[PDB]
Amino acid sequence: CHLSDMLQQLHSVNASKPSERGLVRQEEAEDPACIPIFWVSKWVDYSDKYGLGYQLCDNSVGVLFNDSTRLILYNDGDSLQYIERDGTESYLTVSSHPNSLMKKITLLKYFRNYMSEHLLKAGANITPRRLPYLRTWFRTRSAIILHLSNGSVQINFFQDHTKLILCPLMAAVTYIDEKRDFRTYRLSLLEEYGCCKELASRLRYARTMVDKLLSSR
């Protein structure tokens, strides 16, 4: 299980106190091989009425609706994946779908418009890399926590625009800092080589966030 592996990876790095290093050698912990294929580039919280809309870095759009269904529009602009409450995955198109799915598709297009016109694409400088959906999300005062169906957990921090993408299959983390510089690390190498105070702080917070996901299944 991805989240459990992630909790272990984060305990291990954090128990090592990586910032309390005489000689921090954070560069030697980079692993460009573990760069994620997918992360969330943009999002819009319309959850008080409809759901949470988001764009992945491949330009695909998705919505986790309030009724616990999910609609994914692929980056071709017409292919859909729909996920009913019982988890049934199906392939459809905007051009050919059930009539009952019109309100949802209309909503997705509205959200996609807002996101396309007004929001910045996180990680737009990065060349990445099956298509994950948003399993669950929540917000704190500090951050939004997005858990994708491929096991990845992304945590975006509001105040300083820093972000973590935690990749349990690679035991890795990608950190996008205040400068929009994107660096991908193997967590066990952060244990050996150490890291800056700011990243160690975000990793401590990340473990609390994975605790919250594991405790709210």
Binding site: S41, K42, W43, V44, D45, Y46, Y114, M115, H118, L119, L120, A122, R141, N156, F158, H161
Partner: peptide
């Protein structure tokens, strides 16, 4: 309290 990602 942002209701969307970075503009």
């Amino acid at each position: 309290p942002p209701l969307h990602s970075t503009a």
